[PDB]
Design a protein around this ligand. Sequence first.
Ligand SMILES: COC(=O)c1ccc2c(c1)NC(=O)/C2=C(\Nc1ccc(N(C)C(=O)CN2CCN(C)CC2)cc1)c1ccccc1
Length: 291
Amino acid sequence: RLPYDASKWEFPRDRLKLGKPLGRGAFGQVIEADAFGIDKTATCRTVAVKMLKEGATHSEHRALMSELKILIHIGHHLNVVNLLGACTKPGGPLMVIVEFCKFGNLSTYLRSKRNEFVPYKDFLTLEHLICYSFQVAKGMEFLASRKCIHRDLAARNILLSEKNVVKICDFDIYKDPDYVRKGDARLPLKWMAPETIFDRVYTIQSDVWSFGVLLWEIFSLGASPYPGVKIDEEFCRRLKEGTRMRAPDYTTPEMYQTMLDCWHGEPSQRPTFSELVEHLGNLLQANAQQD
Ligand SMILES: COC(=O)c1ccc2c(c1)NC(=O)/C2=C(\Nc1ccc(N(C)C(=O)CN2CCN(C)CC2)cc1)c1ccccc1
């Protein structure tokens, strides 16, 4: 759609060697791959490649090329999943090469660390959890500055790479039910602000609500929000009137206070991601203080 600077972005297909799919979805697939020299050094880096499936409608091609263009628009930040390059020229498939985050989505990761957590000292600790939280806030402050709205901020959509760096991704009902297991899905409604459940309107301050739900997910070590409750039209009703989740098993009091601040029923009275970054950095620095 928008102009495309091939000098900056085009990567040669003959320096890309595809491996196995990391995941396959309704509209495309993400393949694990090796790229030679994509960061301008003389190195092989494992990257992830968004590309189409073998079916592939012109609407599915147009969408990937739109995502590529939007990624170029957003630009780089440590705490988003970054565009590394693309292959768009005649001679092969459309491929959008992005950062590989080896540990996978954060929800699944945290659930896997439940017998490997200690509040403070290999293991996860409060330091890790407030870190992940600050990093997602830093990531979202950046996206707000690019005038983006995420619309589906959840711990499933946060990826973990090396050195406890965590990165926001914008992507089940899809996957083959013969192969579907217990947490292989998530009900997005549980992350939606009252004004979005109800009026279907997305803003950056509705993303601040979902960030609160994400915080809850981090500090439950990857449990599902609203435990027990069935999500009917009275869930909604109660939600719009003031009902909120209880503190999860691994929260500190300050972090639970922050969830509740992010769940202000009134969008303008929720913290901004700039205010969350400042407050969460304070909490992070306090946590590792000494005597
Ligand atoms: C805009 O950018 C994007 O949109 C985007 C989207 C997805 C990913 C991405 C960028 N970048 C990644 O890394 C992604 C995934 N990554 C992944 C990583 C590790 C795993 N895990 C834990 C494995 O075990 C995989 N394992 C395979 C074998 N080799 C040897 C090692 C890695 C699984 C998925 C992933 C993709 C599909 C769905 C879930 C996540």
